[PDB]
Amino acid sequence: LLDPSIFASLEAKLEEETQIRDTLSQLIQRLDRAVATAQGLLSRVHSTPRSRYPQLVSQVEAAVKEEAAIISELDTVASKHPYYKYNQRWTRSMQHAIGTAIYCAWLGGFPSAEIGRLLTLEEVGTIFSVPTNLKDRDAFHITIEEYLLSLVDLTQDLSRLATNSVTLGDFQLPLTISAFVKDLFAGFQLLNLKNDIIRKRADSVKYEVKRVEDIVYDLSLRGLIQRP
Amino acid sequence: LLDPSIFASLEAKLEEETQIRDTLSQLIQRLDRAVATAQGLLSRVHSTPRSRYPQLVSQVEAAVKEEAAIISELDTVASKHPYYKYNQRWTRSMQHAIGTAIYCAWLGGFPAEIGRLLTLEEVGTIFSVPTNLKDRDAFHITIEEYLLSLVDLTQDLSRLATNSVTLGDFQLPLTISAFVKDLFAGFQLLNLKNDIIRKRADSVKYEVKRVEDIVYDLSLRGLIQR
Amino acid sequence: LLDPSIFASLEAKLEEETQIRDTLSQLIQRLDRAVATAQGLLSRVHSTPRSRYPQLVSQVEAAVKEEAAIISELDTVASKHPYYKYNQRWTRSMQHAIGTAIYCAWLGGFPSPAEIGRLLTLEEVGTIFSVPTNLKDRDAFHITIEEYLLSLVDLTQDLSRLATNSVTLGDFQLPLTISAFVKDLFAGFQLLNLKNDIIRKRADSVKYEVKRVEDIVYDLSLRGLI
Amino acid sequence: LLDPSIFASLEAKLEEETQIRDTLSQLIQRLDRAVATAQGLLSRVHSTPRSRYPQLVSQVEAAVKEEAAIISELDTVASKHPYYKYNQRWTRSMQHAIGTAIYCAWLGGFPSAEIGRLLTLEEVGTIFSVPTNLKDRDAFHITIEEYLLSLVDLTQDLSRLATNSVTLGDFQLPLTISAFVKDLFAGFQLLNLKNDIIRKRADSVKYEVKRVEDIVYDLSLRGLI
Amino acid sequence: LLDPSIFASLEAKLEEETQIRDTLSQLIQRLDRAVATAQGLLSRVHSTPRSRYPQLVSQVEAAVKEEAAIISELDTVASKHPYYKYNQRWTRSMQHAIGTAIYCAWLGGFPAEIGRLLTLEEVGTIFSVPTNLKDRDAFHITIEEYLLSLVDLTQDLSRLATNSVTLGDFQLPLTISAFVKDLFAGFQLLNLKNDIIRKRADSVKYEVKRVEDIVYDLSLRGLI
Amino acid sequence: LLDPSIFASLEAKLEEETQIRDTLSQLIQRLDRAVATAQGLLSRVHSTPRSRYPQLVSQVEAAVKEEAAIISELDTVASKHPYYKYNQRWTRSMQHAIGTAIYCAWLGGFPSIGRLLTLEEVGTIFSVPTNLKDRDAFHITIEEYLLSLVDLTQDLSRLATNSVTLGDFQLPLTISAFVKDLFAGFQLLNLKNDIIRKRADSVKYEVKRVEDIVYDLSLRGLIQ
Amino acid sequence: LLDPSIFASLEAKLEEETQIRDTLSQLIQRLDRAVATAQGLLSRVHSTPRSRYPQLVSQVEAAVKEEAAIISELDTVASKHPYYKYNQRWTRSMQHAIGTAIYCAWLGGFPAEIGRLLTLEEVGTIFSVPTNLKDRDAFHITIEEYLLSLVDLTQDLSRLATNSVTLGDFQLPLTISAFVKDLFAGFQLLNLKNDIIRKRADSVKYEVKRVEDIVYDLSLRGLIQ
Amino acid sequence: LLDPSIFASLEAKLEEETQIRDTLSQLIQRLDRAVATAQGLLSRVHSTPRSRYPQLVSQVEAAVKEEAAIISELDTVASKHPYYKYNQRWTRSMQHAIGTAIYCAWLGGFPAEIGRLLTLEEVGTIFSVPTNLKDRDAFHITIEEYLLSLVDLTQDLSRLATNSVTLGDFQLPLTISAFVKDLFAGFQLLNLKNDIIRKRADSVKYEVKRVEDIVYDLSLRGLI
Known part of the structure; x- marks a missing residue:
């Protein structure tokens, strides 16, 4: 006939895969809303004078930190499973969160207000408390590509x-x-x-x-x- | 403004990924040619009488064994890098090789009985590779391939x-x-x-x-017989 | 600037629709497993002589009844929300369930060895599954003529x-x-x-x-x- | 052999669906033509100075009111059947009519002029005399998505x-x-x-x-x- | 600025298109129902011995005649407008009706010698419509349909x-x-x-x- | 068999349809060349000041008139066979010729900058009916316009x-x-x-x- | 400005490429018509008994040979210019010509052994052209075409x-x-x-x-049996 | 049954083509890196005054020269095989390299005479490769690339x-x-x-x- 485990272990695999997918979906939707909040906060730069940048940046600094909260949870959950299996589910959201952090620091935030600062990949990893793909480690991390x-x-x-x-x-x-x-x-x-x-x-x-x-x-x- | 470490790390990552992809491509190609050989040998069953099965089967067995050799090399390479980073490159070839092995055993190979169905574990035994790995990142054979x-x-x-x-x-x-x-x-x-x-x-x-x-x-x- | 009620109502709509979709999905998956069990049981008819039909039928009947259990739950949930907003999610499973019941009755089941060739009316199918059929003046979970x-x-x-x-x-x-x-x-x-x-x-x-x-x-x- | 009741019920269902399709189609056609009239009226804003906006606005207002008339019939018809069975047929036309009304009010129309006013969904429902966001009742209404x-x-x-x-x-x-x-x-x-x-x-x-x-x-x- | 006559002509044209579509569609529906009745009557030939063929034939003949009635009406409508503008609407149905008529004749109908092949002209006679109108724009039966x-x-x-x-x-x-x-x-x-x-x-x-x-x-x- | 009349009628129909296709295609190719002439003449408006518009206009007018001549010939042939059986062959070219005429009149031609020829005026220029209803003959459609x-x-x-x-x-x-x-x-x-x-x-x-x-x-x- | 030599060389290149296009296209058209003739001859095998296979085969053997004649000329022309610059223009036609030849020999042509598969070398012999030409640029027949x-x-x-x-x-x-x-x-x-x-x-x-x-x-x- | 020579020739063809593709790929990748370096150097012209052009041009010249060092190697390899079989793999990179060379000379390089247009022959001299090769299968630079x-x-x-x-x-x-x-x-x-x-x-x-x-x-x- 056909060893029942062939269709049983497959079913258990699909069960757990769907459960992990749903957990990651919840996490990614929360991160997406946090990133949307930070992006809406950054949108005010288009009507905010440079003089009032310190007030906006701090607010953005809050929202970004909120992201780093959810990301932290993600870092735990995602690290219980292979990276290259369930990446391409958070890579876009993580890229947008990295973007909000870099935009914040460009406006004079997360110092380590000097307009024009570029966060290194390591600095983004420090702000979000996650490793970077500058090395290989087989865990949850942010990639150079996302950056x-x-x-x-x-x-x-x-x-x-x-x-x-x-x-x-x-x-x-x-x-x-x-x-x-x-x-x-x-x-x-x-x-x-x-x-x-x-x-x-x-x-x-x-x-x-x-x-x-x-x-x-x-x-x-x-x-x-006054250019030359 | 972009940090030089990004340039250096991206260059090194490109070197390594190019070398890995070249090795995987040549291994997968050798496996595909061995699988094509076993498939052409199996296709003779459509003109071979049942009485003449044990000959062909042996000829197919050798072919399958050849596959295993190449597979044993693929393992050694693929197990040094994340499985889900590169699995989509060999999954089709591994599926075809599993198919050739199961076909050979159905014809009486890898033990007389016509109609024997190798389980996933017997396939992994024949190919000397693990099957249905979960919390271990190494080259393996999946339930889906089987x-x-x-x-x-x-x-x-x-x-x-x-x-x-x-x-x-x-x-x-x-x-x-x-x-x-x-x-x-x-x-x-x-x-x-x-x-x-x-x-x-x-x-x-x-x-x-x-x-x-x-x-x-x-x-x-x-x-x-009714 | 948009009314805050827009944002609030949109998030509330999303949460409620997600809850309803998850509930309906689990119900429909359980119903699909039950219908698959009944279908596999019926598939034995291809290897069962007519003399041994009353046995099979009984099993199938039980299987069908199990369907009618889950369907019950489905009704209770699906009737709390507009029918045409969510009917496309269960219509295929309900069609397959109707099919298993009609096949069972064709082989001698659900009467009112046994007689081969009976065709259940839509009303009789609804009686078996304890659900309305062809509801035109009431928004409630029901079985359609098209499914039948x-x-x-x-x-x-x-x-x-x-x-x-x-x-x-x-x-x-x-x-x-x-x-x-x-x-x-x-x-x-x-x-x-x-x-x-x-x-x-x-x-x-x-x-x-x-x-x-x-x-x-x-x-x-x-x-x-x- | 199929039950004759199946033939009869299927024929009756098909006649009813044909009735509703024809009625909804003529209503949606008339609403779309009213919307086209209001849209052409609004298009004059690209050649009209601000000082002459009240002349255009009133002309648009009437047109929008015309839309409402047809909508009031649509409602009456569409509420007699399940909403989610036929809402696909008018949602785009209703969205366009809502758009004409909101454009008219942005230009100073439908007060209680102020250029740039954004009608709330409730105000659009008031103008068209149909409910909005009817998340708990099967009746013709206007959705947040249309708005x-x-x-x-x-x-x-x-x-x-x-x-x-x-x-x-x-x-x-x-x-x-x-x-x-x-x-x-x-x-x-x-x-x-x-x-x-x-x-x-x-x-x-x-x-x-x-x-x-x-x-x-x-x-x-x-x-x- | 576009001429108002363009708008009026387009509106009237589209109203008339819709009216002709509705009239046709309903006539084609009635013809399809009659053809289905005749086809179901003919399908009894699979469970009827040769000896009982005449009976069935009569039952089919009447059915075919019913078709002709509707077809006549179709003519009355379809001839008032250009044939080639609307022919794609009834060509399949007319082909099916011609098939039912030829099948009835093959079983010993419309003269019990089995195996008569009606040509295009007796089909046009049975349905009382012209066939192969070359230099005439009236509802007719095509060689292709036959x-x-x-x-x-x-x-x-x-x-x-x-x-x-x-x-x-x-x-x-x-x-x-x-x-x-x-x-x-x-x-x-x-x-x-x-x-x-x-x-x-x-x-x-x-x-x-x-x-x-x-x-x-x-x-x-x-x-x- | 079936009937030799079917063979003969089908071969005659094929011969006639091929002849009509070939003559219509020759006519449409000539009309397309005339439309290309008028289009090349109109293209000079991108390199001609308004003060030098009359001369160009006259030239374009001549080109359009050339079109009409070929269209006239088309009108004579196309009107011998059913419209809605061959109109798809010339509808695009006729739309282009109408466009050239309307463009010419927009530049000041065909009188009695910025004039819009009515459909009836286009028909007058090309000596063809417009929006023809209840009569099968070569004409110009509102859709082409x-x-x-x-x-x-x-x-x-x-x-x-x-x-x-x-x-x-x-x-x-x-x-x-x-x-x-x-x-x-x-x-x-x-x-x-x-x-x-x-x-x-x-x-x-x-x-x-x-x-x-x-x-x-x-x-x-x-x-401003 | 732009060097006049660029203009001159580009005009000369365009003229030469156009002449080669015209020659190749007329040769390919003639070869296509000959291949179609052989194909129509071969299609009659669907209604020809085996007893009358020699007849048809001979008629095909002529047709294929006619193909070869045209191909011969192609060879000459195609051998003056780089192969890989113009090969994509005749590769389908050469494939179909090879197909007609192999079909002919399968029916008993070019030695009644029905079922004979010509080798690539035998196809090249029939068409008097080299096969699988490596490290020499000249008109040839490829394995992929075969x-x-x-x-x-x-x-x-x-x-x-x-x-x-x-x-x-x-x-x-x-x-x-x-x-x-x-x-x-x-x-x-x-x-x-x-x-x-x-x-x-x-x-x-x-x-x-x-x-x-x-x-x-x-x-x-x-x-x- | 297929001839074994088919299998043998196909296997040998595949091995040879694989080696050629890999060699060409490494050469083209190195050429693309060199062209990217030269392009990054040239991009400084958008922030460099004309007064300091000779400083940039020199840096660019070396860059372009480095390109040539790779191109020679490409020239040695590609010339062992038919040109038109593999030219599509490097034509874009060679076009970009030619662009960097012409840009450098436009800024006063490879003789500050601003605005000089290198002839095709001058580009070929810079890269030590033929240009517009007819009647010889060898790696070269085309008029189209230029x-x-x-x-x-x-x-x-x-x-x-x-x-x-x-x-x-x-x-x-x-x-x-x-x-x-x-x-x-x-x-x-x-x-x-x-x-x-x-x-x-x-x-x-x-x-x-x-x-x-x-x-x-x-x-x-x-x-x-």
Whole structure:
């Protein structure tokens, strides 16, 4: 006939897989709402003068910490199972959380308000209390890829921020945004990435580079920037 | 602004992943050629009489054994890296090799009895690899690979039943009917979450119908024990 | 700026819908396991002589009754929420359950050895499962005419398979009963006007089963077995 | 042999479904034509100065009222059958009518003029004399999803309005449009939109946000505000 | 600005389109019901001996005549508008009705000599509609409909031969074999250009093989 | 067999249909070449100042008249066989010719910048009926007219871009007004046919393009 | 500006490429028409008894030879230019020509041994062109073309077996079954790496099953032993 | 039964092609890294004044020279095999390398004479490889690769002009405009037939428009 364990152990495997999937779904939805909260808080930068950045940043610093709470729980649960089995379920949410943290620090938060600071991957790992993929460890961690993708998203956010900065009267913030996005695009081009998805999304930074360079061009043409 | 350690770590990770993927590709290709050899040897069953089975079986056994050799190397490599990071590269080839081994044993190999069904553990014994590992990250054979190989074997056995009636062996379709019916019963009684495996299991119904119609034809002519 | 009631009502809707979906999912999975048990039990008819039908039927009856247990629970839950908002989640399982009950009664079960060839009315199926049938003026969990007719379309295929295997088992009379049944059912389907092109296509698909059973009876008549 | 009651019940069911399909279809056609009239009336805002808005608004108001009339029939019909059995057929048309009403009120219409007013779902239900968010009763009603989708479409209309305002010499209207679309996008991102279709539309709102922000940027660059 | 006559003409055009669709759709529904009745009456030939053929034939004839009634009405409507604008709506139903008529005639109807093949002209006579209108735009019956109905009739007759052996009529399969063979010969000689009708006429080879296999079964058993 | 009449009638039908196809295809190819001539002449509006518009117009007019001639021949052939059996062959080319005529009149041609020929005026220019009902003959449809208008909007958007390039800042304003009003009419039309509805909603991209051109011009003070 | 030599060389390259296109296309058109002639000749095997196989075979042997003539000219032309620059233009036509040749020899042509499979070398002999040319750039026939033509041959032989049963030849389907079975076994032994070729070679499974079912039905009804 | 020579030749073919693919892949990866380094160096031109161009150019020159060091190796390997069998694997990387070389020379490298356009033969000399090879199968540089690198260079130079206005250099946009305009004139005079090359060459019009708008702004401010 057919040893019943063939269809029984399979059923037990699917049982436990579905249970872990549901637990991870709950965790990921909570993290997603925390990240949405931090993103909504960061959205206020588009109508907040630089002078009132310290008030916003602190608030964002709270929301990010909230994320690091849920992530912590995730770190436990996800570490009870292989990483490469259940990754690609949290990688997008973790990338967005990393993005909120990096945006917060760029606005003068999580110091270790200096606008323009780039958190290293290790600094993001410290803020979220999780290891990084700079080494291999076979546990729950954040990846270099998540970090780079979060940076790619940050460049689009920063292009929008420069456009709105010209509206708010801040004519110097577009210049630092331009320097940041230019240097990030240079690094992305020098990384020579193999994964076609991340290589494509990093090449897509050229549009943001052009947009911020055009903003600086416009400000220079009107004498609103003291460039050489 | 991007840290140099990111550049260095990404370069090293690319070197390592390229080397691992090259080794896995050459191993998987060697396994696929061995599996193709065993499959071509097994395909002769469609023109080989039952009396001449023990010859072919031995010839297939050797072929299967060859597979195992390559598999034993794959293990040694694959077990040094996370299983779920690279498993999707060999799962199809491992499934095909499991299928060749099960087909060989069904024809009387790896012990006389025509219709013997290797369990997952016997397959792992033949290939010298663990089966159904959970809390241990190492190269292994999955339940899913085994069941998919069985789904393929039912189609192979339907073809074999047709060719058997052509060759004059009227009792072999009865064995094939028993096997395919029991496999379909086991599949249907336990609805798999995986809807792709469920689709493949519904695909066994057609082979059940084919073999049952062969048995019907043979019964109408009094060629089968009732 | 949006009213905070938007955010509040959306989160409340999401929580409630998630709860209802989880409850209905577990109920439907239990019902599917019960229907699978009854279907496997009925599958034994392909290897059971008519003389040993009253035994099988009893088991199937028990199996069917187990379905009616879970269905009960389903009703209690599904009737608390709008029918047409969630009916697409259980309609296939309910169709399969209706099918198992109708098949059981065709083999001699659920009367009001036994008589082969009885067709349960939709009302009788509802009586068996203790659920309303064809509810037009009440939002409550019920069984639809479409589910019943689709289960009948499935029954014609199951019965064609049964006739083939009956000839295999030596029962040359059961194919005739099945031929009469399938032909009368196809006639009733032809007289039925079905707006829904899916139901109309599935009802036209009964022509292949009619042809197969007529071919079986032809084969038996040619050989002087009828 | 099938029971004759099955034939009879199936025939009766099919006749009823045909009745309801025809009635709902003629009602939805008439509502869609009223919506098209109100939409064409609203389209004049791209060529009308702010000073002449009260003339257009009233004309739009009447048109919206016309919509309500047809809706009041739809309600009466649609409430006689289960909501979730036929709601798929009018949800887009009802969303469009809600959108015309919200656009009219944004332009100063349906008061209790103030440019930029956002009708609540309850106010839309009041204008159309149908309930909203009827999460506990089987009757024709208006859903939060229809309202949010109409707002998504309103942002796309308002971006064009701001562009044409700069053409028409109105440099103060793009600013209010920018504030409105920005706050609506912020509310969209903060929402528990698990329905992926609504989530994709609320994400597509980003392009309109960028367009209006670029308009305000262009006005700031030239020292016009 | 667009002319108001465009809006008015479009509105009136669409109203008339909808009205013609509704009238047609209901007429096609009634024709489909009549064709289903005649088809179910004909299906009794699988459980009726040759001796009881006349009875059944009459029952089918009336049914066919019922079709004609509806078809007449269809004509009255369909001829008022361009044929080629709406022909795709009734072509399958008319093909089925022609098939029922030809089947009734094959069983000894509309003159009990079994195996009469109505050509296009007697079909048009039975349904009181023109056939193959070349340079006339009225509701008519096409050669394609006729040939497609004949292709369907071959499969029906293969089923009839299979069931005739069950009923004991060992001679009717011979007549059916001759008929299906000659019809397949005519089809192969037609050399149809459009691919659908050519494919459906080539599919007659399977029915030819089925009836020939019935005949060979009967010959092996001396039943012939 | 079946009937040799079937063979003969089918071969005659095939021969006649092939002859009609070939003559119609020759006519449509000639019409397409004439439409290409008119289109190339109209393309010069992207490189011609408004002061030099009359001459071009006259030339374009001649081209359109050429079209009419071929269309006349088409009208003579197509009217011998049923419309709705061959109209799919020429509907696209006729839509393009209508578009060229409407474009010409928009530039000032066929009188008695910015004029919209009514469907009846297009029919007058090409000497063919429009919106023909209750009569089978070659004619021009409302759908062809509206599709030609859809094409004209895109061509006019390109014209506005190239007018900004040439230094003509006033013509983009007229193009904007025209495309705005045409899109408003299109939206009020409620085209049931999904093809025409999709292609008429595709006008929103052209509306946005011309409105953005006017936005750029007004920001620069080049207009207001 | 841009160097004039760039213009001159690009004009010359475009002219030469166009002339090569025209020559290759006329040669390919003639070869395609000859292949179609041979294919129509071979299709008559579905209605030709074995007793009259020599006739047809000779008629095919001429047709194939005609193909070779055209191919000869192609060779010459195609050998002047790089092979891999223009090979994708004739590879399908060469595949079909090889197919007609192999079908001819299977019926008893180019030595009545029905079932003979020509080697690639024998195909090259028939068409007077090299096969599997490595480390030399000249017009040649490839292994992949030969194997693809073999797949097509199986698809034709299935139909031949069906029509042989219809004609009354019960012994030809057995030979077709043996041939197609062994060919599928060889295909599976090859482990073709190129994805399109492996897909087309696994598509032979269906033809194998069709012919095997024909043989099953024939043996069941006591027609073949 | 298939000939064993088929199996043998296919296995040998596969082994040889695998080795060639792997060698070409390592060579192309090293070339891509070198081109990425040279491109990152060149990107500094958007923050470097003209006064400090010779400092950058030198750094770029070495970079480009490093590319050549890899290309030679590629040249040695690829030339052992048919060109057109494997050219698609390296054509893009070679086009990018040619782009970096032409950009370096445009900035005053490989002779500060700003605006120099390397001929195809000069690029071949820099990379020590043939150009436009006819009548010999050897690794070489194509006219298509050169022109496509030029198409990319126009986008790079439009970005450079935008940043040049910001850095204060009001004369470099003028020379960039002259260069891009002459390149577009040549592309239009080329009448390319390959749809890919013709499309990519017509895409230069956007860059022409951008640099001409820059020059227009500068002239409106009296900086020209």
